[PDB]
């Protein structure tokens, strides 16, 4: 009745974070890609994963913890099972390791390595996922069950995009049922524990920890742990996906995972390839990402959305990993350093960004608005291409495109109602007489506050900005409907008339050394507020 554990052999060689094992004569043996414990002490163990099985009987092991405690000749035991990690609603709001251990801060078991759904188990991508950014929500639709890459360069807001996307779902989860709520899983790999702490504090401040969990494999952790983290995150997402719920797995980032896999393979003497990445890198990424899918109605209706992040060195998109991931994913979001420095934050480059899923993932109202917005932006780009070295002619498409570009600037995610209202106003031309540099202040006044009530010119009944519950009504009925069209147009006309009469006139009339500075500060504050 003793606590027996199968002993398989001893440790022979140590090379950094990996090791080799020599089996004792006449032993049961161990399987492939299984978990083992190295008995550094009679009461302490170090975790390892099987990766090679030589003909001579020697084994290759990837360490995961207590590496410094490992020495040759120590005993080894095998669990005989694959890697299973804790999963459930009791993990949210917590920072966890890929092995399931909880990291100190100031329900069931799921397999890390599981096959992806077959063809019949999937359904077309229809449900929308909102990042809170107008540019993404309009020009690059994102649908649940989709795998959208975020490709950029160093210091372009890649991780901020995903963090804001996660945060924007907090309000929706609070309002609507948990059934349609989005559960977020943020994976940090090879990043600083300081950055992880900052992210955790930000999430706690915004209240996203309730529906969010963090999987940390920070640097100073073994390459095996960094290589395992994403699969654990996908398993945590699948737990909800198979139970008719929607998950959002963010990876930051696959580059360091690829580096870790390369390091492990080269240490274990495996055949390399281009850039020394072995030939299994593409299969690794493919089997990591294909696990994100939109399950069929009979399978639960749950979904998993993938937002991997990739960094390109000096815009070298031809790199092996970048090419593989771009080809795998269902579209990409490209961040441009030029635009980021120029002030377009986010710095999305529409020309380089695409969503293969298409408009089927957009909401009806958003779909209708985008149908015209995309063409308007295309025309504005075409005219700006020729307008490089010549005076511009202020046409309606150019004016509306410039106003849209100014609107796209934002720091925090914007609520769907405010975003769609502003976009509709710009599309229908209520901003044609508004100044580009004052569009942000106009939007701030239109959203955060109101002018009809202030000036005693209210005539609508139900269409008011401060009623944040109209977002679902807008989602149900398109803005171009008799129910809301008249009220919306009246409110926009009133706001535009009041603004032009009172605020823009004063702005144009400003002539001083202090008033100009105050106006500049106000404009910047509005820009980074809305």
């Amino acid at each position: 009745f003793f606590k027996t554990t199968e002993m398989i052999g001893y440790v022979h060689s140590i090379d950094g974070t990996i090791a080799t094992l020599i089996p004792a004569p006449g032993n049961p043996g161990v399987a492939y890609n299984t978990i083992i414990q190295i008995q550094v002490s009679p009461t302490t163990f170090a975790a390892g994963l099987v990766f090679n099985l030589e003909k001579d009987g020697r084994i290759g092991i990837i360490l995961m913890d207590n590496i410094t405690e490992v020495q040759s000749g120590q005993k080894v035991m095998a669990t005989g099972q694959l890697l299973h990690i804790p999963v459930g609603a009791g993990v949210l709001g917590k920072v966890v390791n890929p092995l399931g251990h909880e990291v100190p801060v100031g329900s069931t078991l799921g397999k890390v390595d599981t096959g992806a759904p077959n063809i019949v188990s999937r359904s077309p991508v229809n449900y929308n996922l909102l990042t809170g950014f107008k540019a993404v929500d309009t020009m690059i639709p994102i649908g649940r069950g989709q795998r959208e890459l975020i490709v950029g360069d160093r210091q372009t807001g890649k991780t901020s995009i995903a963090v804001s996307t996660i945060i924007n779902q907090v309000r929706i989860n609070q309002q609507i049922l948990s059934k349609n709520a989005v559960i977020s899983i943020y994976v940090s790999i090879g990043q600083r524990c300081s950055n992880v702490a900052r992210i955790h504090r930000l999430l706690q401040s915004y209240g996203a920890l309730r529906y969010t969990t963090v999987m940390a494999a920070t640097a100073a952790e073994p390459a095996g742990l960094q290589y395992l983290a994403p699969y654990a995150g996908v398993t945590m997402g699948e737990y909800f996906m198979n139970r008719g719920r929607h998950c959002l797995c963010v990876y930051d980032d696959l580059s360091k995972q690829a580096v870790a896999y390369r390091q492990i393979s080269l240490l274990l003497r495996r055949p390399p390839g281009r850039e020394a990445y072995p030939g299994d890198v593409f299969y690794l990424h493919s089997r990591l990402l294909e696990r994100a899918a939109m399950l069929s109605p009979g399978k639960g209706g749950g979904s998993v959305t993938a937002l991997p992040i990739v960094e390109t060195l000096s815009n070298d998109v031809t790199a092996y990993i970048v090419t593989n991931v771009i080809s795998i994913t269902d579209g990409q979001i490209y961040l441009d350093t030029k635009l980021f420095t120029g002030g377009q934050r986010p710095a999305v480059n529409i020309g380089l960004s695409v969503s293969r899923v298409g408009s089927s993932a957009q909401n009806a109202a958003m779909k209708g608005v985008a149908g015209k917005l995309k063409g308007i932006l295309a025309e504005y780009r075409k005219l700006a291409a020729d307008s490089v070295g010549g005076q511009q002619v202020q046409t309606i498409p150019m004016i509306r495109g410039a106003r849209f570009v100014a609107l796209f600037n934002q720091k925090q995610p914007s609520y769907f109602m405010n975003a769609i209202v502003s976009l509709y106003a710009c599309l229908n031309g209520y901003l044609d007489d508004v100044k580009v540099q004052y569009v942000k202040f106009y939007e701030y006044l239109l959203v955060h506050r109101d002018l009809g009530i202030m000036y005693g010119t209210a005539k609508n009944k139900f269409f008011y900005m401060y009623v944040q519950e109209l977002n679902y009504l807008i989602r149900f009925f398109t803005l171009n409907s008799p129910i809301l069209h008249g009220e919306l147009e009246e409110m926009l006309k009133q706001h535009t008339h009041l603004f032009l009469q009172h605020y823009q006139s004063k702005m144009n009339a400003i002539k001083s050394e202090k008033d100009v500075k105050a106006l500049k500060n106000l404009l910047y504050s509005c820009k980074r507020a809305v």
């Binding site: 001893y10 440790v11 022979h12 060689s13 140590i14 090379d15 950094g16 974070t17 410094t68 490992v70 020495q71 040759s72 000749g73 920072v95 990291v103 100190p104 801060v105 100031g106 160093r154 210091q155 090879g190 990043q191 600083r192 524990c193 300081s194 992880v196 702490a197 900052r198 504090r201 940390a216 920070t218 640097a219 100073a220 073994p222 390459a223 360091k256 580096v259 870790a260 390369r262 390091q263 080269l266 240490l267 003497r269 390399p272 850039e275 020394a276 060195l313 000096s314 070298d316 350093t337 420095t341 980074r528």
Partner: protein
């Protein structure tokens, strides 16, 4: 306590360059163990080795902090009972050390009341401090575009002939003299003449007060020294800074010039250790090797460390894996441009490629 392997005896089996194999009948010591050669060998200096790998239960592979001249097979080596240790405390203030921690200034014995191992585990997530305070370096571009953070990490990425060393000296003069906390300099794989000039400048500025009390310490492992020393000198200096941070509770400055030599030295021996080259010729373990050190270099709850590291970009090619990895382990980055230097602008700083974490309205004005 006493390690069971202290005094353990081994024999030299194979020697290749800076790589030496040691066989112990009793058993191979633990990884990172420090060994000393007992045989005289007619060497003018002692021979020290550090273990990095195990080839079997009895055999290990080690690198040499010094040259392998006059080294024979079957040479007798003895364990030191632990990893490489360096003196710590205020007794080291205003002193010059090497990778082994032995005084090299010829200024008399140093009173050491405590020796600490170079290798230490990095602080965990919970042991981190959230400090957002701007720092004034007296430089317009740096203070404007990419302001520094107290207790944070700064990189000076550049090629050759751009002014990394000059900027480091300028920052030292501006800050370390008036800074309440102490300072530690790491001359890793750089010019001994520049090290001497820095020492003279510190003596002139009275930072190093031989007759009185000093404020800075120096650790010098230069290009003349072998790769093992060029690699472990930075870790020794970091251990000094960690002691000053934890056991005292100071806000210490840590200047390093240059970190790239650490990776270069490790690559010099990767193949000999028996690890295939990965990319551009760099060792596969570059990411982990640099990440461990960068994480050890951080501010904690007890004390704070403000780190400034010079980074060399070969052929001015920023895409090199070492700088690419280093980018992610820093709070602020200052990129230098040869074209800007040629245009006569000094410091040659490209604000477009520069960045900083604290460039948010919440922290700064």
């Amino acid at each position: 306590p006493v390690a069971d392997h202290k005094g353990r005896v081994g024999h030299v089996s194979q020697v290749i360059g800076a790589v030496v194999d040691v066989h112990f009948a009793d058993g191979v010591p633990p990884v990172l163990t420090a060994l000393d050669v007992v045989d005289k060998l007619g060497r003018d200096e002692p021979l020290t080795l550090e273990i990095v790998q195990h080839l079997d239960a009895h055999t290990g592979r080690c690198i040499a902090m010094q040259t392998t001249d006059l080294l024979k097979l079957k040479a007798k080596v003895v364990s030191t009972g632990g990893n490489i240790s360096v003196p710590v405390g205020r007794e080291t203030l205003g002193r010059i050390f090497n990778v082994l921690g032995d005084a090299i200034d010829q200024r008399g014995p140093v009173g050491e009341k405590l020796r600490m191992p170079i290798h230490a585990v990095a602080p965990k997530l919970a042991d981190q401090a959230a400090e957002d305070a701007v720092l004034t370096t007296g430089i317009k571009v740096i203070d404007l575009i990419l302001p520094y953070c107290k207790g944070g990490k700064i990189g000076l990425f550049g090629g050759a002939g751009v002014g990394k060393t000059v900027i480091i000296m300028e920052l030292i003069n501006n800050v370390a003299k008036g800074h309440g906390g102490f300072s530690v300099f790491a001359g890793v794989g750089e010019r001994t003449r520049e090290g001497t000039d820095l020492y003279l400048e510190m003596m002139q500025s009275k930072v190093i007060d031989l007759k009185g009390e000093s404020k800075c310490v120096l650790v010098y492992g230069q290009m003349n020294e072998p790769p093992g020393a060029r690699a472990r000198v930075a870790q020794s200096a970091l251990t000094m800074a960690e002691y000053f941070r934890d056991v005292e509770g100071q806000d210490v400055l840590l200047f390093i010039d240059n970190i790239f030599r650490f990776t270069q030295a490790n690559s010099e021996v990767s193949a000999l250790l028996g690890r295939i080259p990965a990319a551009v010729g760099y060792q596969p373990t570059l990411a982990e090797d640099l990440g461990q050190l960068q994480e050890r270099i951080t501010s904690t709850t007890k004390g704070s460390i403000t780190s400034v590291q010079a980074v060399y970009v070969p052929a001015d090619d920023i895409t090199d894996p070492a700088p690419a990895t280093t980018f992610s382990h820093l709070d602020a980055t200052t990129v230098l441009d040869r074209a800007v230097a040629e245009s006569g602008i000094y410091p040659a700083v490209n604000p477009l490629e520069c960045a900083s974490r604290i460039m948010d309205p919440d922290v700064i004005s």
